[PDB]
């Protein structure tokens, strides 16, 4: 019903830039305008390329140099660590040995250029929640041998659902009036920066995208080599789905084209089949490799048309809407868009404290910018972890562990209630811990908990 209304309401927002104001239009335009089930299809291997079948690079550093010369390293740096009870960027948390996500990031790129002499650039995509703080943090890399760029993605106004007008217009101009429109915004933002054009002219042809908290997102020269062979404009790293990845976004062939399918395309009556991992086998790591010229072309041609992720939220009793999109969703707009199915050692992200237990234990070590998995670990799978809200805030997490217990032998751990952990504890097989009503527990140092379901102090 009409359109200039919401338009003038936004154009009056002095904050937003010209590249941000009209943009919020496509999303509002479409969302207000409008993937059918009976047409879905499972892609072939021709679409999803077996990692282990690709040609690796030779030892000839000249070849490595050539490839590493066309690559840029971008990190989505738009996200706070609020989910883990921590203030600051998600990447400023400490992974292992006092080093933060942004800290190892600047480390690994340096070791790749150190070993090959090239100078692969680091470009962090920020947002209003992490931009200025990042700019301040990165000064720590003043003498580092990497040119780290940063840019602020688009800022969009949340929408108050009822009246459906921009919230800042009603005067909500503080930080609560705005919302990071999803990571799908990585493409028009990289271009809105003016940095891609730069990179393009600089011999740069591809960009490897990954979450700032996926420790496995390391540059794979092989994947890059391949892209230049088949001339793939888009390449998504995917991996086999596990029980921890049921509702995850997968890859499908829809109307003869590759496409990501999130829970934002499947009806209620179909979620069951959707969640059937026997039907859909792999998921999206977000590890994405994208040809640069192809980006510019599609952004300058106002081509991208990602499915709007509605996303409603309540704020101070005000029900609002954050219109967002996903990056993996750009895969359909790219020529010879593929995806590569790789080992899970490339999808090691930190989403909660339960993952910090993992990477901070004996199951892993830091070896020259590399969250190295202990080879002693027999089973190929990592132990599952189930800590309660008592362990959600990293600060409390660390304190509830005088030292991180060995888990290299661990198969599973259940942890609920007011539980504390001494030092040099060892965990094997299946293990449970839980205090009772108004009860508190504290597992003593040197404890070797082996196949137990701790339900009370009455359990040594």
UniProtKB/Swiss-Prot annotation:
EC supergroup of this enzyme: transferase
GO molecular function terms attached to this record: UTP:glucose-1-phosphate uridylyltransferase activity
Gene Ontology BP, a term: sucrose metabolic process
The protein's Enzyme Commission number: 2.7.7.9
The keyword Manganese is assigned to this record: no
Gene inactivation effect: Reduced number of seeds. The double mutants upg1 and ugp2 display severe growth defects and male sterility due to the absence of callose deposition around microspores.
Catalytic activity field: alpha-D-glucose 1-phosphate + UTP + H(+) = UDP-alpha-D-glucose + diphosphate
Tissue specificity remark: Expressed in cauline leaves, flowers and siliques.
Sorted UniProt keywords: Acetylation, Cytoplasm, Nucleotidyltransferase, Transferase
Domain of life, per lineage: Eukaryota
Subcellular location: Cytoplasm
Protein name: UTP--glucose-1-phosphate uridylyltransferase 2
Gene: UGP2
């Amino acid at each position: 019903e009409n359109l200039p209304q919401l338009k003038s309401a936004v154009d009056g927002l002095t904050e937003m830039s010209e590249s941000e104001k009209s943009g919020f239009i496509s999303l509002v335009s479409r969302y207000l305008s409008g993937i059918e089930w009976s047409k879905i299809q499972t892609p072939t291997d021709e679409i999803v390329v077996p990692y282990e079948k690709m040609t690796p690079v030779s030892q000839d550093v000249a070849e490595t140099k050539n490839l590493l010369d066309k690559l840029v390293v971008l990190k989505l740096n738009g996200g706070l660590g609020t989910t883990m009870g921590c203030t600051g960027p998600k990447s400023v948390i400490e992974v292992r040995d006092g080093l933060t996500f942004l800290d190892l990031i600047v480390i690994q790129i340096e070791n790749l250029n150190n070993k090959y002499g090239c100078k692969v650039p680091l470009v962090l995509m920020n947002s209003f929640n992490t931009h200025d703080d990042t700019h301040k943090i990165v000064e720590k890399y003043t003498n580092s041998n990497v040119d780290i760029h940063t840019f602020n993605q688009s800022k969009y106004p949340r929408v108050v659902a009822d009246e459906f007008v921009p919230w800042p217009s009603k005067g909500k101009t503080d930080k609560e009036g705005w919302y990071p429109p999803g990571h799908g915004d990585v493409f028009p933002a990289l271009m809105n920066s003016g940095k891609l054009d730069t990179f393009l002219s600089q011999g740069k042809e591809y960009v490897f995208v990954a979450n700032s908290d996926n420790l496995g997102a390391i540059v794979d020269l092989t994947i890059l080599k391949h892209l230049i062979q088949n001339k793939n404009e888009y390449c998504m790293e995917v991996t086999p789905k596990t029980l921890a990845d049921v509702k995850g976004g997968t890859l499908i062939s829809y109307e003869g084209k590759v496409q990501l399918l999130e829970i934002a395309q499947v009806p209620d009556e179909h979620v069951n089949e959707f969640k059937s991992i026997e039907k859909f086998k792999i998921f999206n790591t977000n590890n994405l490799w994208v040809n640069l010229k192809a980006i510019k072309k599609l952004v300058e041609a106002d081509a991208l048309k990602m499915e709007i992720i509605p996303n409603p939220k309540e704020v101070d009793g005000v029900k609002v809407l954050q219109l967002e999109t996903a990056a993996g969703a750009a895969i359909r707009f790219f020529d010879n868009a593929i995806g590569v199915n790789v080992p899970r050692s490339r999808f090691l992200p930190v989403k909660a404290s339960s993952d910090l237990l993992l990477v901070q234990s004996d199951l892993y070590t830091l070896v020259d910018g590399f969250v190295t998995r202990n080879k002693a670990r027999t089973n190929p799978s990592n132990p599952s972890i189930e800590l309660g809200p008592e362990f959600k805030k990293v600060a409390t997490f660390l304190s509830r562990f005088k030292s991180i217990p060995s888990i290299v032998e661990l198969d599973s751990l259940k942890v609920s209630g007011d539980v504390w952990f001494g030092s040099s504890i060892v965990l094997k097989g299946k293990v449970t811990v839980a205090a009772k009503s108004g009860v508190k527990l504290e597992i003593p140092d040197r404890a070797v908990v082996e196949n137990k379901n701790i339900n009370g102090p009455e359990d040594l």
